[PDB]
Design a protein around this nucleic acid. Structure first.
Lengths: 82, 162, 166, 74, 98, 394, 74, 83, 79, 71
RNA sequence: UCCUCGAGGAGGAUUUUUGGAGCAGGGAGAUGGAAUAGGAGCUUGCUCCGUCCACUCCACGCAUCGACCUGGUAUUGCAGUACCUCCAGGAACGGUGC
């Protein structure tokens, strides 16, 4: 029903987030709030026509995230049960 | 009292009068400037006034370093790898130093981003045609010893020793 | 004019930019001490003038004495003491051991003598046209005797400080 | 919540409003709204060439309101 | 109230994608069309899908330079992804799984 | 096999066809509401008067119970009546109660109504709310909505029967007639009111009477209103004889032989006495100790032969043996006229053996002496001995 | 005529061939099947039109309220 | 119901501040009215935009919808803003 | 004080032709007669016409349901 | 649950990237539900621009990361 | 009211977060270049066509203000600041509307 409870239970997983400006940040999801505030640690960000930069921490808002990319070994069938 | 990581981590850091992040490292009497990797290029200015540094070298790669205060020291030689470690170095205050010859200003020509240089209160400034040699060797510098470089001084520097 | 932490320089070149002149004044004042603030305006009332407020009053006095009449951007700037106190300094604020003083003004209170002796570090006590100032340190008392020998305070008379005898 | 904007002092005063896309209008306000909607009676809009065109009483929504400058001393 | 509006309104067109396990296409604002099976949905159109194929077209964008060369189309595949309902512009359901 | 131990507990029972007393309320033939009220009230073990009155009221016969004050006679009259009302439900007719409880006082009637409401808790059965000296309109409005039991005053019941507010029909109206404090109802003051209450009643209906005291004339007056009554009091069933004097002394196990030697030496308890023992070997040792102390004594137990026991019984009957030691087998059934003294040096585990040993001496209206030595090990039988002494009047 | 609210007008437009044009310039023409209270549209046998020219048929098309600019009942 | 940056913006009313809009327009002057929805109404304001068209107006009103940032003096960053 | 909702109700009762400008689109506007309105500023225009100022053309559509999130300015015209 | 993602970076120098491509490096002091950041003595990089105490709205924020140690 | 085995215990519709965002830089000239990176006429040389920068021409794309450089010129003034004298030339930069 609510996607925020499913996104909050995806902690300690290496995922990727593509923004609306073409910047893709790949990192381990460590913190998710009700407003989809993605706080990741040891992330790598690649902007549009720029070099990738590695950061120890990153905080991306929910309104600035356009798409997400999860690994194929993620238990989406078990995490969907509330 | 050498410059270490514990001395840089315990030093005060704040905002200067030009709204830049400056760390006050004065009153330490460091004989050699080293172990600057603990700052991780988080400071825009370096306040190393009233020290005992003999050579301005041994600095790591810091792209955010734009101002360097080396006043009231005994700096007599400049390192040749200053451009590879500070590409954005624009302010260099070397007043009251131990520079005696103009040949120490030859590694200072590699800093293309340097625009403000201070070489006052030095025996190298008392030599003949020191300002013309500093204008000819460093054309990127616009302000030398709190004086704006004019076109006539550039023409006089380009005429002699061509 | 009493010495303060803020030194005001005037008769400078007003054709340069405000930020470049402020950076040049900060680079000039960094050789004498830590510059806490730099007040520089370019309006019709404050044209061609600026001021630097430092942490210590001795560094500001040395910068006013050394750079008196120094050529700054083609024009020799004149440095002097500030009339009032700075706002940042007001926000941040709120041989022998005994020295003999002669030809002291009788209208000066103990607070003015304490503010005059505050250039040296903390002393033991003060005694009040003759006065006796005793410091806790010998080197601080020697520096206070060497500094107050002909100081510029109450210029109608001349103050003389000498070391006490046994 | 839902506090109305402080538009009581700018009532019946000739002000110039800026709208998105680079639009400029000038007119007298005739009311207020909690959704930042302004009614400008006898409004005149500035064209691209510089000529003013009178559009009469218009209604400007708060979604495209950029800046409103009062041309009269209040 | 909410379940009847979700099973009788436009969201039922999403609910036919997860119940019958059909493939639908989503055209986004970045000129990209992703065809896939909708696995999880919500009220804010948060679509978590699996086995998606995203196709678009790109220009060289001053790649080499001198005044004669054309853009080209491209496509890629993702195992599992999740897209928010803000960037979803068009959603088309078509019998393409059969 | 312990059915005699419930009757020996001290509960005089009289009548023909009396049912067995129940051990607990869970196996007494009660309904779920009565068991729920007994569990909510905190009753872990039922009263013996209640255990004697509840099967007699559940069987449908008339019962007359007498006990001490505060023994739970109201609960013993309310619980089997509510159990029979819940198990055998009938149609609640207009102005007709299923039970009639007679109380001599208004406060006692209010307490009986409160006990009936507590026994019928968490149910739709509301019995009565009426008392003397109050408004009759509120009582008539409370009784007109439905009345299961009728617990009130005889004067208020006569006023309700005279004004056609409450009466007993002929075919099927009430099945139980309760009478609380029947000693006051059978007196000269409440005689015609109780007579008019018992005359206008159903023929097929049980009559229950409970009181703290019961004279002979009041019991003879109350027995005429009931049909084949069952009496239940304390104590008569398996009780000690009142003609034999019972004495209990607190002594040790080793001091019992010294007390018996002092009673045989100083007092006249050596000749013509029967001494009860615990075992046969202890009885033989006591007989050998009595024979070694220059006293003629005989013994009769299971370890000896039948001919030797018959010779010992003949010597005790003729007068050849002064004392006769015997086990618990010779305590009951033995009828010897020479047995005047009964010395119980070893206390038995059951009170029936002690009652048989006390009743063996001083029978057929004659007097007798019974002296028992109570030790610290027989702590469980001390309450039974105290109950037997209270029932026999010792 | 009588002032009609847009919600019964959207409820009564179901089953009729309409065309919804978005802010990007593209339009979808088809029979309106579902219209909820959040101004969302779901149509069947939709055809795409761009710059006055037809693109192709898609079938059941779902358009949200954040992208749809206008709708016209044909 | 009231935020701490909203309280800091409401407490800074009456000082020489500036508000830079999303289009680049910087309205500078004394903040006369500051509501909870970032509505900045200033008197004797000055327009210095990213376009650079610097002018002086008697009164200006910028809403919080197109407001990008606000430059305030550092007189209220010490107390009671220290948490 | 004149409310905008009261002005919209008076314009719907008068049945006058009004022109609506779009948000971030100055080249094309709409024009028509508003019949009804709602709380979300949804206009129902009868015999509406899209006027393009760049091409100087007018394309009629008919009954149009314009949302209030796109209409930035609305003025009254005499035509 | 704990909501300690914004409280751990309090009183620290962070660099927030805007939507138009600007970067504001300042000391984050407080926040709110609308992600309103108050950066005292912040620098604007894209060149250096002296700004100071800049109160940027949460609608123009994209990403934020740690810059260095607290002063 | 709950637990234990009838009982016991106690919030996608105007100012913030489900986005009104995406895309392209005017035209011409036997102009010039793809060291290692286009295809075809199946290397190399040549010819043709859907990607930039430099200069020239039409319509220095246009007008605006801010920052900035040269020369001349005025102000000598004690303050906590969007920015600060004026004239003329050049236009390397920013954004606004067409």
């Amino acid at each position: 029903m609510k996607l925020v409870r499913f996104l909050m239970k995806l902690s300690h997983e290496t995922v990727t987030i593509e923004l609306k400006n073409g910047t893709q940040v790949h990192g381990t999801i460590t913190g998710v709030d009700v407003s989809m505030n993605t706080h990741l640690k040891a992330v790598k960000m690649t902007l549009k026509n720029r070099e990738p930069v590695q950061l120890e921490t990153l905080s991306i808002r929910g309104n600035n995230i356009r798409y997400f990319i999860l690994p194929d070994s993620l238990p989406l069938d078990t995490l969907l049960v509330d | 009292v050498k410059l270490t990581a514990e001395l840089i981590e315990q030093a005060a850091q704040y905002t200067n009068a030009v709204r830049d992040r400056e760390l006050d490292l004065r009153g330490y009497k460091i004989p050699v400037i080293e172990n600057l990797g603990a700052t991780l290029d988080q400071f825009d200015a370096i306040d190393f006034s009233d020290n005992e540094i003999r050579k301005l070298d041994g600095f790591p790669l810091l792209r955010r370093l734009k101002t360097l205060l080396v006043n009231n020291n005994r700096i007599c030689r400049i390192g040749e790898g200053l451009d590879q470690a500070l590409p954005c170095l624009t302010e260099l205050i070397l007043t009251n130093n131990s520079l005696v010859e103009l040949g120490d200003l030859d590694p200072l020509a590699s800093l293309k981003s340097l625009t403000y240089l201070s070489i006052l209160r030095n025996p190298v400034t008392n030599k003949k045609h020191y300002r013309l040699y500093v204008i000819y060797k460093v054309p990127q510098v616009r302000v030398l010893d709190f004086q704006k470089v004019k076109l006539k001084e550039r023409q006089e520097a380009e005429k002699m020793f061509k | 004019i009493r010495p303060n932490h803020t030194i005001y320089i005037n008769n400078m070149n007003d054709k340069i930019k405000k930020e470049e002149l402020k950076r040049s004044l900060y680079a000039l004042f960094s050789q004498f001490g830590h510059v806490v603030d730099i007040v520089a305006l370019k309006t019709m009332k404050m044209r061609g003038q600026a001021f630097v407020i430092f942490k210590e009053l001795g560094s500001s006095t040395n910068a006013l004495r050394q750079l008196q009449g120094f050529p700054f951007y083609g024009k020799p700037m004149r440095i002097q003491y500030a009339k009032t106190d700075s706002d940042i300094i007001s926000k941040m604020r709120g041989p022998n051991y005994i020295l003999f003083l002669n030809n002291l003004p009788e209208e000066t209170n103990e607070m003015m003598l304490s503010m005059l002796f505050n250039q040296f570090p903390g002393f033991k006590e003060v005694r009040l046209d003759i006065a006796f100032v005793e410091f806790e340190n010998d080197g601080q008392a020697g520096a206070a005797r060497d500094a107050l020998q002909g100081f510029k305070i109450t210029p109608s008379h001349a103050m003389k400080i000498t070391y006490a005898k046994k | 919540k839902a506090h109305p904007p402080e538009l009581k002092k700018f009532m019946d005063k000739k002000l110039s409003l800026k709208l998105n896309g680079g639009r400029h209008v000038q007119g007298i306000l005739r009311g207020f709204d909690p959704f930042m909607n302004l009614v400008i009676d006898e409004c005149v809009e500035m064209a691209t060439s510089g000529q003013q065109n009178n559009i009469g009483m218009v209604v400007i929504r708060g979604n495209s309101i950029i800046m409103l400058e009062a041309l009269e001393r209040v | 109230r909410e379940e009847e509006e979700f099973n009788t309104g436009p969201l039922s067109v999403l609910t036919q994608s997860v119940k019958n396990n059909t493939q639908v296409l989503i055209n986004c604002r970045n000129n990209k069309k992703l065809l896939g099976r909708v696995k999880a949905f919500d009220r804010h159109c948060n679509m978590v899908l699996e086995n998606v194929k995203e196709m678009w077209t790109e220009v060289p964008k001053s790649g080499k330079g001198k005044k004669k060369s054309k853009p080209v189309n491209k496509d890629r595949y993702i195992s599992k992804m999740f897209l928010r309902g803000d960037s979803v512009i068009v959603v088309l359901r078509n019998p393409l799984i059969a | 096999v312990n059915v005699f131990r419930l009757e020996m507990e001290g509960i005089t029972v009289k009548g023909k066809g009396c049912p067995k007393p129940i051990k607990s309320w869970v196996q007494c033939g009660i309904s779920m509401k009565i068991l729920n009220s007994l569990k909510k009230h905190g009753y872990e073990k039922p009263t013996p008067i209640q255990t004697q009155a509840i099967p007699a009221i559940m069987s449908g016969r008339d019962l007359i119970g007498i006990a001490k004050t505060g023994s739970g006679k109201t609960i013993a009259f309310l619980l089997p009546m509510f159990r029979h009302i819940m198990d055998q439900r009938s149609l609640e007719e207009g102005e007709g109660p299923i039970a009639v409880i007679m109380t001599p006082t208004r406060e006692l009637a209010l307490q009986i109504t409160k006990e009936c409401k507590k026994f019928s808790k968490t149910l739709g059965l509301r019995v009565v709310c009426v008392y003397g000296g109050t408004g009759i309109s509120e009582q008539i409005a409370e009784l007109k909505r439905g009345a299961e039991i009728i617990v009130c005053t005889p004067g208020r019941m006569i006023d309700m029967l005279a004004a056609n507010s409450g009466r007993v029909t002929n075919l099927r109206r009430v099945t139980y007639v309760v009478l609380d404090e029947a000693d006051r109802m059978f007196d000269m003051g409440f005689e015609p009111q109780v007579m008019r209450i018992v005359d206008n009643v159903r023929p097929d209906r049980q009559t229950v009477m409970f009181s703290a005291t019961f004279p002979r004339a009041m019991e003879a007056l109350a027995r005429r209103i009931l049909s084949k009554p069952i009496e239940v009091q304390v104590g008569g069933r398996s009780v000690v004889c009142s003609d034999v004097e019972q004495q209990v002394i607190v002594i040790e196990e080793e001091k019992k032989f010294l007390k018996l030697l002092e009673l045989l030496g100083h007092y006249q308890e050596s000749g013509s006495v029967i001494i009860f023992v615990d075992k046969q070997e202890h009885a033989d040792g006591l007989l050998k100790d009595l024979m070694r102390a220059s006293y003629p004594c005989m013994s009769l137990h299971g370890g000896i032969d039948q001919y030797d026991r018959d010779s010992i019984i003949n010597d005790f009957k003729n007068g050849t043996c002064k004392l006769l030691v015997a086990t618990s087998v010779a305590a009951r059934g033995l009828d010897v006229k020479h047995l005047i003294l009964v010395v119980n040096y070893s206390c038995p585990n059951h009170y029936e053996d002690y009652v048989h040993r006390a009743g063996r001496t001083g029978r057929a209206g004659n007097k007798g002496y019974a002296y028992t030595f109570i030790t610290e090990d027989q702590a469980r039988y001390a309450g039974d001995i105290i109950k037997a002494l209270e029932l026999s009047g010792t | 005529s009588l002032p009609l609210n847009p919600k019964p007008f959207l409820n009564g437009l179901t089953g009729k061939p309409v065309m919804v044009k978005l802010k990007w310039g593209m339009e979808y023409k088809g029979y309106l099947v579902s219209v909820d209270g959040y101004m969302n549209m779901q149509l069947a046998n939709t055809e795409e039109y761009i710059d006055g020219a037809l693109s192709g048929h898609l079938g059941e098309v779902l358009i949200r309220c954040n992208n749809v600019l206008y709708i016209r009942g044909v | 119901s009231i935020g701490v940056p909203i309280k800091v913006l409401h407490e800074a009313e009456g000082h020489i501040v500036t508000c830079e809009t999303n289009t680049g327009e910087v309205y500078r002057g004394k903040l006369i009215e500051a509501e909870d929805n970032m509505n900045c109404q200033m008197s004797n304001i000055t327009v210095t935009y990213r376009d650079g068209r610097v002018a002086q107006l008697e009164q200006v009103y910028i809403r919080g919808s197109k407001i990008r940032f606000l430059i305030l003096p550092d007189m209220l960053k010490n107390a009671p803003m220290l948490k | 004080m004149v409310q905008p909702i009261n002005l919209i109700f008076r314009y719907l009762q008068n049945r006058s032709r009004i022109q609506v400008w779009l948000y971030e689109q100055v080249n094309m506007r709409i024009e028509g007669c508003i019949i009804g309105f709602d709380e979300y500023m949804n206009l129902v225009l009868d015999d509406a016409e899209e006027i393009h100022s760049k091409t100087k053309s007018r394309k009629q559509l008919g009954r149009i349901m314009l949302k209030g999130d796109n209409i930035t300015l609305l003025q009254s015209v005499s035509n | 649950g704990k909501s300690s993602k914004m409280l751990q970076h309090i009183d620290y120098r962070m660099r927030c990237i805007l939507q138009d491509g600007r970067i504001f490096i300042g000391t984050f002091k407080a926040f709110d539900k609308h992600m309103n950041l108050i950066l005292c003595d912040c620098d604007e990089f894209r060149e250096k621009r002296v700004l100071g105490l800049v109160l940027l709205r949460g609608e123009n924020l994209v990403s934020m990361t740690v810059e260095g140690p607290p002063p």
